[PDB]
Amino acid sequence: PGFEGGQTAIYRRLPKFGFTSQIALKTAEVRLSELSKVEGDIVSLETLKAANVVRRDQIRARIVLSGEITRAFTVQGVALTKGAKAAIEAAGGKVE
Amino acid sequence: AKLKTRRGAAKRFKATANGFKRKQAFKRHILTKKSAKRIRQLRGCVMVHVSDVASVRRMCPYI
Amino acid sequence: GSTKNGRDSNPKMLGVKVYGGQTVTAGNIIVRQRGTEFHAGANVGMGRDHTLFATADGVVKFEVKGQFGRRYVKVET
Amino acid sequence: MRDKIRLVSSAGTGYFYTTTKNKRTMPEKMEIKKFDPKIRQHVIFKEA
RNA sequence: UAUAAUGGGUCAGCGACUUAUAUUCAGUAGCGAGGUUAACCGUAUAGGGGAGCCGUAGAGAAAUCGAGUCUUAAUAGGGCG
RNA sequence: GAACCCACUGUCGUUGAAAAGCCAGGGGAUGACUUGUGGAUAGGGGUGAAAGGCUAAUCAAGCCUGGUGAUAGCUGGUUCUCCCCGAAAGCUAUUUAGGUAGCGCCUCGGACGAAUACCAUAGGGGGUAGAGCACUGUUUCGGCACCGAUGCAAACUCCGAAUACCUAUGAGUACUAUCCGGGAGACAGACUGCGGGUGCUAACGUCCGUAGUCAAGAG
RNA sequence: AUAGCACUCUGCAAACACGAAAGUGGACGUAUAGGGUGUGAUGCCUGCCCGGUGCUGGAAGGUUAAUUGAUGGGGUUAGCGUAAGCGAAGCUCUUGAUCGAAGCCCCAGUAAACGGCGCCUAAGGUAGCGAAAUUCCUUGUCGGG
RNA sequence: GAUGCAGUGUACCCGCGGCUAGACGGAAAGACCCCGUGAACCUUUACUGCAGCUUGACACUGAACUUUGAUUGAGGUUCUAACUCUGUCCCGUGAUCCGGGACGAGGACCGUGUCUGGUGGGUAGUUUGACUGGGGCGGUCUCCUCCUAAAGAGUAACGGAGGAGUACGAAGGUGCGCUCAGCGUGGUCGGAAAUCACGCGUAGAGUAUAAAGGCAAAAGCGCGCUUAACUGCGAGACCCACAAGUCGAGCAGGUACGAAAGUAGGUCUUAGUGAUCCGGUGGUUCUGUAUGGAAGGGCCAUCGCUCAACGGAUAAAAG
Predict the structure, then answer these.
(1) Distance between CA atoms of residues A17 and B37, nearest Å
(2) Stated in angstroms, how far is C38 CA from F12 C1'?
(3) A63: nearest Cα among A89, A92, A33
């Protein structure tokens, strides 16, 4: 596969570009709706790992507006975007 | 066994929502004679062609 | 012996792309010409390689006009 | 043959253009006014 | 190709698209914004085991941001969503 | 010149008596002679009065086993039945030319719904057939480099069709047209008619465009 | 292949060959002997060229391998200063001053070394032979049979 | 190149002896020829490595005297203790090996290990292109223009005929301004042919370069000022298997020319060219492996050798 009769292949006649980032492999992305899986009102890296929404080897996580929530959630140690923070405050939770 | 990636093609292709993005060639060393519009337009990233997406998928089973 | 011939250049695909009576949008190319067989009329621009394109939305029309009899192509809004 | 030469901005921004010259017809260095995007102002570019 | 192109003297028996793993698509079945366990334990096709994988969000080389994001001086325009 | 050693000519034999012989002739025959028993030299090595000769009927690198089921764009073969649809021998690239990859052509599933085709009407560009000498070139006969008659041209044109191509509208007859995806095969073509190059206005010759048939189709 | 002839190497723990070494043959020999190379009884003989390659001797005028290590630039680190973004010891990254033989360059000899023998070169065939195992035209021409 | 097809001629059924005209008779997947990015062996001033030989530095490796160069370097003469003896004698010993002891001849040499320059067909792995009216020799391989090409595009042959691998800081931008060339008459050494006056017809001149398509708002020619030969883009279309290629109104920022509308993102256009990997230079609100840095990497701009067999087997290769 990838051999096209002798002429320079597509994957070799185009240039290499980019470098890999290590911190991206440890950063975690979390949906707002996924917080419903967390037992209790505390949102943290430990509680997320306990709920199995973040892998045990990640060091930091972020929450993005993707779905909806109904319970109040006090968020600690997790990065919150503008929409996610607005949704949490509307639901009645607090940050830090 | 487990399928193996073609690392050379992985280093040239990257994953998007509905396809693959690449850069453009003809911009490494010989550049003085090239015109300004050529220099600008060949800059940036474009999309992989449909006739080549199948080969790219075969070469990159996971990304 | 041998032959001193057997050289030719690749094709260039010249010609009239849009014919009279058709509808075009601004930017459409009308004539691909090595020289000015046709000259630019109202709402028609000339490129650096003598190409003719439409600078407005309308309908193409060919005419013969002028003292020299130059062939003109224009776009009616 | 015509040599390839680099014109550098006088402002010191590091910006440079490239061109070609014929030594016999232009033995000396070449200076010309051009636009410098780094400062958004026309300045004098001098041959390297 | 009747070819004067190849193969077969005849009969009986044997003789060629498989198996393991990974991945994509199709059909069908369970569950369903969720789905599913591996090694292993287990008087063992049961039951336990949630580490892990896939989906749920993109943009960017990256930092980073996020229903937006990259380029730019530009809340212009344009690319990808 | 016998024994012994050898192998120059010819006949027969060639599924032989014989996987190298017989018959009739022939050379050496005290020598660098012939021969018995035992021993030494082992494979990129041994030995060779040197022919690449010999090394167990095997030698431009012995034989046996193992790597081992070596690789083979090559040749060959591939086993029961019925129904539907149905190609190609082209372009581009190639350490390529009898291989392969993308596109073109086949089939199956999903979205889609005339946006498709034939014909009629309306609009549009051309530089071919033909013709011509106004440019370029070339040709003959005449009168003072010019002029009057006169002929020719793939790379000449003052001219110039029929066809073909593009767009829009419309009746009728036709499940057409486009997009996404699963699976391919194929990239050695042949003849005939029309327009041509090449050849000798030769070839069941060769190379192109265009249409029919064979290929894959009997009567 | 051969007797004969010539060139060249070897002073003995010889040259040379085999082997991984130990060692073995050469040889229980000692230049009149051993190894390699060419020619090939015998008679008459064996011409010219050292330009090219090789071999032999000398020169030491030029080049640099390891090694060596002068200097040059840079990273970090200390100490002053409201303020200048100043800036060292040590550690450490890199640079290559100089030293350095052979080979190569250069000079001379060597052809019974490999080789060459038409205005030009190293020089353009001495004897002897010649339609000759060498002659295309060629069944060249004359004599004999 | 027919026992088996068409037409036609001849021919009752079956042996034995003999013969070789045919059954493209039997025998051996043609050895001649061509192909496969097949094999083997041989050659060399094909490519690349190694054994062997050869040079030097360090180590094994010491001492006493001597002369000369910048505490230190290089030579020369001696000595014995490291070390050599396929030299004599003694013993193990009944022994041409070996080991130890005595003597003799040498001796810091020779020789061995590590590193390093040269030589190296002795040996080893390999390479030595394609097209082609069979192959070889010859010629060609990329780009541009005209014909073949059958009035849209495209279209082949070892078909016909020519060019390219550049040039230019003005030969670019802009304001203003001007038309060529050949002919007929008179004049200085100037006439076929020099500079200059007028007149008739007429684009037949020129446009850096080959040809075609063009050129009066001349795209041809001259002068003054200048650097738009710009930065960030870009609606829309042409061409195309891909990689690639081409035209472009308009928006924002600085600029030159012009009183102004306005023109200018190089040159009348179509050839003047090379992908990817590696490496160099300048900048970078990126990254930078415990932390602060740095090194290294990413990004923007740009540079270099080769790939002309010109989509470029590994920048190394013949018979």
Answers:
(1) 22
(2) 103
(3) A33
Chains B and A touch (3+ CB pairs under 8 A): yes
For the four alpha carbons of A37, A38, A41 and A43, in that order, the dihedral sign comes to negative
Adjacent-strand bridge partners of C72 = C39, C63
- A72 HSE (CA, 13 A, CB side): 5
Residue A6 domain-assigned? Answer: no
Q: Which domain holds residue A49?
A: 23-95
In strand H, the nucleotides that come within 7 Å of a protein beta carbon are: 138-141, 143-148, 152-155, 158-163, 166-170, 212-216, 219, 226-249, 253-255, 265-270, 273-280, 282-284, 287-289, 297-305, 311-313
Using what technique was this structure determined?
A: cryo-EM
Chain A contacts of B8, Cβ < 8 Å?
11-12
Q: Is the backbone of residue C30 left (phi > 0), alpha (psi -120 to 50) or beta?
A: alpha
**Domain locations in chain D?**
1-48
Specify the CATH number for the domain of residue A80.
3.100.10.10
The count of domains in chain A is 1
**A72 domain-assigned:** yes
**D19 chain-B contacts, CB cut-off 8 A:** 32
In a domain, A37, yes or no: yes
Does any domain span residue A85? yes
CB burial readout A43-75, b (16+ within 10 A) else e: bbbebbbebebbeeeeeebebebeeebeeebeb
Resolution of the deposited coordinates, in angstroms? 2.7
The amino acid present at A93, given as its one-letter code, is G
What percent of the residues of chain C are helix, what percent strand, and what percent coil, each to the nearest 5? Answer: 0, 40, 60
